[PDB]
Design a binder for this molecule. Structure first.
Ligand code: NA
Length: 184
């Protein structure tokens, strides 16, 4: 798979309107197992390893999928997805709150055991700039004899890379859509 990334990122079959973006990605991206059942501490180490929020979140998603620390950073999510995964990842319908994101993810896990997702928020409050598009990650953690829970992961937000639901909710007002996507 990582060799397919290398082929895509260096290819000449690219619309020149996308050239600078692909170059920014190529410049940032580095290419170098974790257990099948991840722990919260595993996720912390993976989030630290990878660290632009769209690139970071896609890198982390990829690493989680392969259970290995492969991609890191040293942007249109469609272009990023095409490079890292080889296609755009299919999205959910728009969701209206981070609470609803959590519920949808728990439902997907309940039915299909799908456990790792990229979240795209429209009106995330970033420092200084305010409401803005922001990507981050969510993984379902299953600890012994405990109900599965959603761990949000924001590898960009280095002050708190594993926020609680309460903490991440601080970064939203009622303004905003959310979308969930995942590599299959
Ligand atoms: Na926070």
């Amino acid at each position: 798979s990582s060799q397919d990334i290398i082929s895509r990122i260096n290819s000449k079959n690219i619309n020149n309107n996308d050239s600078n973006e692909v170059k920014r990605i190529k410049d940032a991206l580095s290419i170098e197992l974790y257990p099948q059942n991840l722990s919260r501490d595993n996720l912390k180490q993976m989030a630290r390893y990878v660290n632009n929020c769209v690139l970071l979140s896609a890198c982390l998603h990829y690493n989680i999928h392969h259970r290995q620390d492969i991609l890191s950073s040293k942007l249109d999510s469609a272009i990023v997805d095409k490079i890292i995964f080889g296609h755009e990842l299919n999205q959910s319908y728009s969701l209206n709150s981070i609470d609803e994101v959590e519920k949808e993810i728990l439902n997907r896990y309940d039915i299909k055991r799908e456990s790792s997702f990229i979240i795209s928020a429209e009106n995330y409050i970033a420092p200084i700039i305010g409401e803005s598009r922001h990507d981050f990650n969510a993984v379902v953690i299953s600890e012994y004899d405990k109900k599965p829970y959603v761990q949000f992961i924001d590898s960009w937000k280095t002050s708190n890379i594993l926020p609680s639901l309460q903490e991440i909710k601080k970064h939203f007002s009622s303004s905003g859509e959310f979308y969930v996507r995942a590599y299959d």
